[PDB]
Design a protein around this ligand. Structure first.
Ligand SMILES: [Co+2]
Length: 258
């Protein structure tokens, strides 16, 4: 029926409706650190989020997205392995039912408690919908979350979750600064891949940061209180909304550091 993360509609079934699921450039992948090639030609990333405008937070039934105004070059990513400017459109997380799982990408097979995705689209394509049809249409910054100390900058997000508990609910979410979610270091790995939920389009240049951010147990606990279902439907907690690692196939992971 429609896709999700359960036993009957989970990632192992997606290929029946989205054949690209068994494509040549699917994500996520395991990052083997000893096989990643340091590339001295990669430039440092340039994150300009000082003019970011958040607008709303929404429970879409598979995660929660914070959306931004992308009508102008307000929050952009450039540099790194990218050509051109990429505008931030939304961020969302993937998390687990337990602290030892939740991330999509793994490092030397290590799974983190969660993974944040900042989604950006290539301005040369004019709109998001046109960007997904192109091999270099999106750039996703992935950041791992480990449980330890609370992350002050994530608290405003944690606190509004009660108001978007079920699928289809949304809340005004203005003035949130995504700079409070970045690690100290911008060292990263990069590879060509795809979106990790249907339609699984292979239009993404992934930028995965080496340094995780810490969140407290209580913060991640609130994520696990969300629901997959809509209001008045039987309760199914929103947990484990992560796709397992896919075959690397003909791809090289490059490192911006040694
Ligand atoms: Co994602």
């Amino acid at each position: 029926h429609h896709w999700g993360y359960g036993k009957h509609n989970g990632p192992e079934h997606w290929h029946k409706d989205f054949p690209i699921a068994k494509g040549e450039r699917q994500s996520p992948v395991d990052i083997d650190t000893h096989t990643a090639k340091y590339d001295p030609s990669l430039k440092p990333l340039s994150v300009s989020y000082d003019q970011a405008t958040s607008l709303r937070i929404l429970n879409n039934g598979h995660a929660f997205n914070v959306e931004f105004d992308d009508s102008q070059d307000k929050a952009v990513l450039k540099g790194g392995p990218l050509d051109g400017t990429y505008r931030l459109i939304q961020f969302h997380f993937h998390w687990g039912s337990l602290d030892g799982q939740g991330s999509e990408h793994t490092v030397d097979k290590k799974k983190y408690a969660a993974e944040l995705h900042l989604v950006h689209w290539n301005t040369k394509y004019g709109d998001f919908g046109k960007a997904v049809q192109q091999p270099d249409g999106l750039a996703v910054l992935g950041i791992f979350l480990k449980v330890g100390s609370a992350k002050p900058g994530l608290q405003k997000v944690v606190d509004v979750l009660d108001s978007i508990k079920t699928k289809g609910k949304s809340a005004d979410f203005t003035n949130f600064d995504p700079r409070g979610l970045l690690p100290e270091s911008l060292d990263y790995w990069t590879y060509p891949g795809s979106l990790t939920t249907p339609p699984l389009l292979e239009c993404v240049t992934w930028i995965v940061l080496k340094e995780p951010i810490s969140v407290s147990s209580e913060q991640v606990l609130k994520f696990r209180k969300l629901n997959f279902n809509g209001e008045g439907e039987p309760e199914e907690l929103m947990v484990d909304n992560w796709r397992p690692a896919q075959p690397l196939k003909n791809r090289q992971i490059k490192a911006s550091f040694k």
